């Protein structure tokens, strides 16, 4: 029978009445999806900052954030302590389509984030003079219907991300995506509590009580949280999850996945970091 999540009530998107489940809601999900949704800003703004300075320093924190999630351990655990015990294990990409080596995680936990563009290497990120070129180096010319690599790694549609030179708002959003083979309320609550203790979010009102089961057939700026941030995954492409799992030879044809509520994170960066992150050749380039 399907897993009983007592505290979070279930919810269904395509048809499946629940008489209390006869209609496609039978087995365990292919995987649970956990989004750590990050909003970041260089809160004290100055003149003389270039458009790139809007996002380079916020993006530089993805590496420490990814390390925190992967090294997080639930002290005083009654069943699961670390992420390795709970996350989805992937082994090898398809034998063809190895061109995405060192851009998608090969061995270990399925964990996606912008840092994958630089192999989760802060030094490689620092030695990069044009973040936009690196980000777009593998997008198609709109000739491929599946989800693009940028969408897969960022977790957002792309216009919400704010990573562009014409960003008028100084708040940039991205996401870290975790695929979990098992559901553990204690561990997930521990991870959520840790992230909101480290990075409290301003009057964050995100919903936290519904798991969505999806079945696939066939001046100074301030960070705000609102209804536009609720269920952000719903604004990804339809083929997003099937294409993500197809890259690893996992099929969602007659089975479903379970998307959990997102964990909010808010990062405020100061001019000292915004400068220390700056690449020397962009100071005299424009």
């Amino acid at each position: 029978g399907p897993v009983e999540f007592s505290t979070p009530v279930k919810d269904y998107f395509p048809p499946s009445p629940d008489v209390v489940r006869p209609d496609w809601y039978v087995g365990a999900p292919v995987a649970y999806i956990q989004q750590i949704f990050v909003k970041a800003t260089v809160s004290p703004w100055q003149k003389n900052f270039l458009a790139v300075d809007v996002f380079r320093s916020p993006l530089s924190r993805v590496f420490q954030l990814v390390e925190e999630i992967r090294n997080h351990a639930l002290r005083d655990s009654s069943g699961v302590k670390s992420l390795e015990e709970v996350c989805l294990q992937v082994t090898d990409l398809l034998p063809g389509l190895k061109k995405l080596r060192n851009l998608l995680p090969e061995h270990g936990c399925l964990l996606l984030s912008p840092g994958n563009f630089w192999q989760n290497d802060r030094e490689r990120f620092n030695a990069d003079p044009d973040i936009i070129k690196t980000i777009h180096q593998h997008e198609p010319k709109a000739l491929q219907t599946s989800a693009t690599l940028k969408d897969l790694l960022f977790g957002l549609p792309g216009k919400y991300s704010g990573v562009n030179l014409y960003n008028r708002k100084r708040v940039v959003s991205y996401t870290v995506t975790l695929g979990l083979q098992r559901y553990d309320s204690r561990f997930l609550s521990s991870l959520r509590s840790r992230l909101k203790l480290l990075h409290p979010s301003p009057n964050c009102t995100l919903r936290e009580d519904s798991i969505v089961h999806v079945h696939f057939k066939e001046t100074e700026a301030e960070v705000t949280w609102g209804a536009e941030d609720e269920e952000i995954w719903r604004k990804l492409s339809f083929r997003h999850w099937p294409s993500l799992f197809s890259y690893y030879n996992i099929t969602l044809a007659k089975r479903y996945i379970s998307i959990l509520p997102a964990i909010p994170v808010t990062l405020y960066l100061n001019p000292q970091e915004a400068l220390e992150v700056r690449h020397p050749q962009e100071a005299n380039r424009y």
Partner: antibody
Amino acid sequence: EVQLQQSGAELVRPGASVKLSCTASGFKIKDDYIHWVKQRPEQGLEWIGRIDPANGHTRYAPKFQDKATITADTSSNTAYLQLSSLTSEDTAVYYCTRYNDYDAFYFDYWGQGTTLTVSS
Amino acid sequence: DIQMTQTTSSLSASLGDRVTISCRASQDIRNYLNWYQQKPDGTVKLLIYYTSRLHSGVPSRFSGSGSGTDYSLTISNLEQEDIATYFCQQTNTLPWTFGGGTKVEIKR
């Protein structure tokens, strides 16, 4: 709202065994750990152990290994602490509590406390 | 394993006075310090679970600060209801240890 009623004061002989009880109201013990703490005047609070009533998985401080035994009945929503091989050093106040945040691990709600005296 | 020590076991103050309790950990505890209040009746109540934060229902006159090994609770203006003992608990390494409480009393 949330209350943790404890049993009355207890008097027992040395070498005996006691079973203290802690009944929850306003919440289900399945949803949280239940902890026992020991207060002794002039020595300060100290942690005994905890139980996860959903799993029945207990853990103790190394001081009380082989001393304390924690159990829980979900139907009655009640946790229990059993003390064995009692001695004078066990005369103290025992608090039942829980926590609700699983990274901070703060004890949000406490019982009033049960005084246990061991004398012949 | 981790020993927490409060410098003063007693402290005398007056209504409306600025009060500060402090305690030190034997090793880094990574800001995992909670502050509890015990009344003379004996009932305990959480004040500052996390460094600097506040448990719901606690008056805003309570505050917390500190880092590394040294942490401090502060009462901006001592009220008559704030006569009690205060304990600091470390939740960093698994056997949680409390510090010997510090009592706060009025000036006799």
